C-alpha cells in the first residue's frame, strides 16, 4: 500500500488552496486516501486518462480499479443503465 508522492503532493496543494482541478496520473497502483475525496483524478489506462470523481467508498482501493481500458465492446451496450446519480 502506497500513494504516489507526486499525486499526493498535488492533492495536498489543492486542498490548501481550496481549489478543485483535474489531476492527471499514470500511477494505477497507488492507493486512494481520504485527502483525495472530492477530487477528480484522471488515471491512465495505457491509452487514455479516465477521470475519477473520488468518493468515500473508493478510499482504500487502487486507482486502477476505476480506469479500465475501452477495449471490450459489449453487445447491447446501449441498453445498459447508469449508476444512480
Amino acid at each position: 500500500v502506497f500513494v504516489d508522492d507526486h499525486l499526493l503532493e498535488k492533492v495536498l496543494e489543492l486542498n490548501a488552496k481550496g481549489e478543485k482541478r483535474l489531476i492527471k496520473t499514470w500511477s494505477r497502483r497507488s492507493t486512494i486516501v481520504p485527502e483525495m475525496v472530492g477530487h477528480t483524478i484522471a488515471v491512465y489506462n495505457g491509452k487514455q486518462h479516465v477521470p475519477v470523481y473520488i468518493t468515500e467508498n473508493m478510499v482504500g482501493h487502487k486507482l486502477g480499479e476505476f480506469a479500465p481500458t475501452r477495449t471490450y465492446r459489449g453487445h447491447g451496450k446501449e441498453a445498459k443503465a447508469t449508476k444512480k446519480k
Binding site: T40, V50, K85
Partner: protein, 161 residues
C-alpha cells in the same frame, strides 16, 4: 424506437434455446425484435452457468435456432423497464448535446462503464473543437447535470484540457 439489447450466441440443447449475449434487461421483456426476422414472443428464459438462454416462439429445435445465431436483438424503448430518478439508459444519453455556461461545446459519442462510475466520452462540435481529442467526464461528478435533452458541465480547470 428500437434499441440493441444483445446478440444471440450458439444454440443451447435441442429445443431451440439460444444463448443470449447482452444486457440482463431481457429478463423483463415479453418480446424482442430479431434482426432480419422481426418481433418474436419470449416463451421462456433461464440461466445456465454464466449464460442466459432464450426460447422464442417458433424456434423449437436446434436447427431453427442456428438460423438466428449471431443476429442482433432489439427491444422497443417503451418496453424497457423504467428507471428510478437519477438513472438513465446509455442510449438516452449518447447523442445528447453537452453544454458549458449555456453554450454547446460537444456531443456525447459514447459512455465507458468504469465500474464504480460511468464516463461520458464527448466529441467537440464546431470547427474549433470538432478536431480535438475526446473529452472524458464522470457522469456522477457533482459538476455534471443531466437535463431532458442535454447535459451540462461546470468545467473545473483541466477537465477539458
Amino acid at each position: 424506437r428500437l434499441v440493441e439489447i444483445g446478440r444471440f450466441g450458439a444454440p443451447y440443447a435441442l429445443k431451440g434455446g439460444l444463448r443470449f449475449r447482452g444486457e440482463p434487461v431481457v429478463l423483463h421483456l415479453e418480446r424482442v425484435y430479431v434482426e432480419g426476422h422481426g418481433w418474436r414472443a419470449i416463451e421462456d428464459l433461464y440461466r445456465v452457468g454464466e449464460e442466459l438462454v432464450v426460447h422464442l416462439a417458433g424456434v423449437t429445435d436446434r436447427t431453427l435456432a442456428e438460423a438466428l445465431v449471431g443476429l442482433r436483438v432489439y427491444a422497443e424503448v417503451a418496453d424497457l423497464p423504467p428507471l428510478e430518478e437519477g438513472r438513465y439508459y446509455y442510449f438516452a444519453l449518447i447523442g445528447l448535446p453537452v453544454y458549458v455556461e449555456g453554450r454547446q461545446v460537444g456531443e456525447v459519442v459514447d459512455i465507458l462503464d468504469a465500474g464504480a462510475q460511468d464516463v461520458l466520452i464527448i466529441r467537440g462540435v464546431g470547427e474549433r473543437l470538432r478536431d480535438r481529442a475526446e473529452r472524458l467526464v464522470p457522469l456522477q461528478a457533482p459538476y455534471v447535470r443531466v437535463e431532458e435533452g442535454s447535459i451540462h458541465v461546470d468545467p473545473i480547470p483541466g477537465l477539458f484540457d
